[PDB]
């Protein structure tokens, strides 16, 4: 009704002159936001010996009070590639480790996983045994030493290996014919694969896993959960900040 300004008639609104651009919406770009390293997960090393289990790279159903957790939960289907940074931080005395090789093995979505120490290295009496699936071969094996290491880390890029054209972040159905409470929001292979960290350190320290998601694509936006509580009616939340009145 009437539309634009200053007569005050019913339905009439005053003039507004829209602002000019400046930032160009570059920062709200989906793939820009996800192409950075995020500290998601922290994990323990397995001993060289025994029958270790692989850790699945699935950052999807998180509750973590971190920016990547909510963000990954903003869409229904997701596709992206992956980059990893694995670091190693001592939890004991750094002089406990004189060599400290760490074998990292990455497995594509669908890879077989049973391993037991099976590859023997021999030298002057004593010997060392590594896992059947830690050896360098078909899938990537990375070996880094923690001892004098200036960064006690490694890192590499890996692609989207799932069989699904897109990863369902939410799934209204079951991933298996038997409908068990377990297979509910499920679907097999909705992830990035799995890794196996193995080392004579294992005690002595842990890791720090960071994910970077290059080439991200999101489908079907979903509600974004709050992050903070609701302040009192008619008030404003007040947070500590850079700006703030001294």
């Amino acid at each position: 009704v009437t539309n634009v300004g200053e007569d005050g008639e019913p339905g009439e609104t005053e003039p507004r002159h829209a602002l000019s651009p400046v930032d160009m919406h570059v920062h709200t770009d989906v793939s820009f936001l996800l192409d950075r390293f995020f500290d998601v997960e922290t994990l323990e090393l397995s001993n060289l010996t025994g029958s270790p289990a692989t850790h699945v790279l699935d950052p999807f159903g998180s509750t973590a009070q971190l920016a990547w957790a909510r963000l990954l939960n903003t869409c229904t289907y997701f596709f992206s590639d992956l980059e990893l940074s694995i670091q190693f931080k001592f939890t004991t005395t750094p002089s406990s480790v004189g060599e400290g090789f760490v074998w990292v093995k990455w497995f594509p979505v669908g890879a077989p996983t049973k391993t037991t120490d099976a590859w023997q290295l021999e030298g002057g009496g004593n010997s060392v045994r590594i896992q059947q699936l830690a050896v360098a071969g078909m899938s990537p094996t990375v070996v880094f030493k923690i001892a004098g290491s200036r960064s006690q880390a490694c890192g590499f890029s890996v692609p989207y290996t799932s069989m699904w054209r897109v990863v369902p972040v939410f799934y209204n159905g079951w991933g298996a014919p038997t409908k068990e409470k377990a297979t509910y929001n499920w679907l097999p292979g909705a992830h990035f694969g799995s890794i196996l960290l193995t080392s004579d350190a294992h005690d002595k320290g842990g890791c720090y896993l960071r994910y970077r998601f290059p080439r991200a694509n999101m489908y079907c936006p979903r509600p974004i959960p709050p992050a903070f509580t609701r302040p009192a009616d008619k008030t404003r939340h007040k947070f500590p900040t850079n700006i703030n009145k001294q």
Binding site: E9, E12, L19, V158, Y219, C220, D233, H237, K238, K245
Partner: protein
């Protein structure tokens, strides 16, 4: 033949957001065609093409009754940290960033019965000593008269007015880049009905959208919950 190279002091460090990729170890994987509808590339677009309902006292609406007048029915300070903007998409998306720029579009939807009618005065009050308490006070400001029964829905744009090019997403004790004023809605007339025993009150749903000039910059990490 070996190239003379000098190692920078920041040498073996991490730096999380480097503009460069790591070395690939599992080449040549061709990915299946992903048809699938509804891909979005920028969060600002879904913020602009979509509306959420505000949280007025925990409900997505304010009420007019057959007894109203003077006092403001809805009042919220213009800051993304405002309470009534709590459950919204725009407010929630904002927590990922440090600064915002632009307008917010609010649209009120009167859901009182067809046999019901009322008129509202909605005002945008700029920063001031203390917020008006009655409508005769606020009506000196930018305002619009909404006569339901002409249009059941009404859109009002809260403008961006500030000496700074961007304002803060995360508010705190009032600063010059913290708050931009208040949005208030008054009842120009109380609810009238065909039978006050059947319809004594009507609810106005209030929804928010990012305005056409709205923008967000500076991605930030989540601080301790509060």
């Amino acid at each position: 033949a070996p190239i003379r190279v000098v190692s920078v002091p920041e040498s073996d460090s991490f730096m999380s957001s480097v503009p460069d990729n790591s070395t690939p170890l599992y080449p040549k994987v061709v990915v299946p065609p992903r048809q699938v509808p509804g891909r979005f590339t920028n969060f600002i677009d879904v913020a602009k093409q979509t509306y959420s309902f505000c949280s007025i006292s925990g409900k997505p609406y304010f009420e007019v009754t057959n007894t109203s007048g003077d006092e403001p029915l809805f009042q919220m300070d213009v800051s993304l940290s405002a309470a009534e903007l709590h459950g919204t998409y725009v407010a929630s998306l904002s927590s990922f960033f440090a600064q915002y720029r632009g307008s917010l579009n609010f649209n009120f939807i009167f859901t009182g019965a067809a046999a019901t009618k009322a008129k509202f005065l909605v005002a945008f009050v700029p920063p001031h000593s203390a917020a008006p308490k009655t409508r005769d006070e606020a009506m000196a400001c930018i305002h619009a008269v909404w006569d339901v029964g002409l249009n059941s829905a009404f859109s009002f744009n809260v403008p961006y007015s500030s000496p700074a090019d961007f304002m803060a997403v995360y508010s705190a004790e009032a600063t010059v880049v913290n708050v931009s004023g208040w949005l208030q809605v008054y009842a120009l007339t109380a609810l009238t009905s065909t039978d006050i025993a059947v319809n004594s009150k009507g609810r106005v749903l209030v929804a928010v959208s990012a305005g056409p000039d709205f923008s967000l910059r500076h991605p930030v990490d989540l601080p301790d919950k509060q």
